[PDB]
């Protein structure tokens, strides 16, 4: 592992960040002082959920809660393939992270994000309560249930 960390090959270190992510070694990746890994995540954060989650962990441990709430909220409003329940977790985290002070950011900007995440989380829970009840309902034909699961187990719908 010395030979690994003693390298200056950049495509290599990118390939190793991806490999650590694959194997699940949050142990070793979260323990890198470097910003090089943060910058690498900032480009692909809004591309994949698993990468965004890593980026948000780096922000939170650095008391940058508002920036994580921003990543999580945009991810919940996006058209990436994300389940409704995963979008409930993202909003719930963003709601908490925007409710606490982050230095350098105005109280107004925090509250406006904490409010957008609170409303979207309220709608998401309604949608989750619906989807669950509809799937379990004995009086609903199977043919329709599959159709319900397609349109409700994804991005959050209007009221």
């Amino acid at each position: 592992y010395n030979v690994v960390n003693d390298s200056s090959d950049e495509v290599f270190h990118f390939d190793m960040y991806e490999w650590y992510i694959e194997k699940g070694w949050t142990d070793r990746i979260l323990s890198i002082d470097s910003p090089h890994v943060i910058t690498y995540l900032q480009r692909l954060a809004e591309t994949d959920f698993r990468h965004a989650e890593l980026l948000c962990r780096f922000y939170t441990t650095r008391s940058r809660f508002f920036e994580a709430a921003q990543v999580q909220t945009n991810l919940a409003k996006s058209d990436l393939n994300i389940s409704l329940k995963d979008r409930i977790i993202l909003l719930s985290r963003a709601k908490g992270n925007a409710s606490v002070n982050t230095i350098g950011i105005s109280r107004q900007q925090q509250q406006q994000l904490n409010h957008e995440a609170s409303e979207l989380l309220e709608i998401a829970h309604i949608q989750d309560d619906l989807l669950e009840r509809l799937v379990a309902d004995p009086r609903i034909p199977e043919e329709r249930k599959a159709e319900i699961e397609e349109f409700l187990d994804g991005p959050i719908r209007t009221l």
């Binding site: 609903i140 034909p141 043919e143 329709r144 159709e147 209007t158 009221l159």
Partner: peptide, 17 residues
């Protein structure tokens, strides 16, 4: 923003196509 429209929906109790 909510807008009720009972007019044209999709029969929740009938399959598609």
């Amino acid at each position: 923003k909510l807008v009720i429209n009972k007019d044209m929906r999709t029969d929740l109790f009938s399959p598609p196509n």
